[PDB]
């Protein structure tokens, strides 16, 4: 059989879109973490002080997932040909 290697330079960018579709997904998980702190504080204000660590932790992890996806999108272009 015959053998044609091809190097498509446009495909340097298409992937950046698909990762970019997943950068907004954890944003849902952002509000879901703060919302739970709102109502849980509305239901029990005195407990609001010690539920904050859990809230910031959840928001930070969800944001970390978003950040890694975004990092793929930005790392996909400025180094790859």
């Amino acid at each position: 059989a015959i053998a044609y290697e091809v190097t498509v330079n446009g495909a340097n960018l298409i992937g950046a879109g698909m990762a970019a579709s997943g950068v907004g997904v954890p944003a849902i998980g952002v509000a879901m973490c703060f919302s739970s702190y709102m109502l849980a504080a509305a239901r029990q204000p005195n407990m609001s002080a010690k539920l904050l660590p859990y809230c910031i932790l959840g928001f930070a992890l969800s944001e970390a997932l978003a950040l890694f996806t975004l990092l793929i999108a930005l790392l996909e272009l400025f180094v790859f040909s």
């Binding site: 509305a42 239901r43 029990q44 204000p45």
Partner: protein, 59 residues
Amino acid sequence: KQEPVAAITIRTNEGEMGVLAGHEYTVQQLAPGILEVEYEGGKKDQYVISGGFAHVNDT
């Protein structure tokens, strides 16, 4: 006995709730704790309770 009041805050098993004029008609258990009442003059009055039921009319 039917005193005018601006707002009232109650403690429940589900948690703590707030009640204003025309609040939605709702009924539920009171959990044994304290109660906060705020009159129209900005003052406040707090009452320890032992359970009970609170009924809020739409009127």
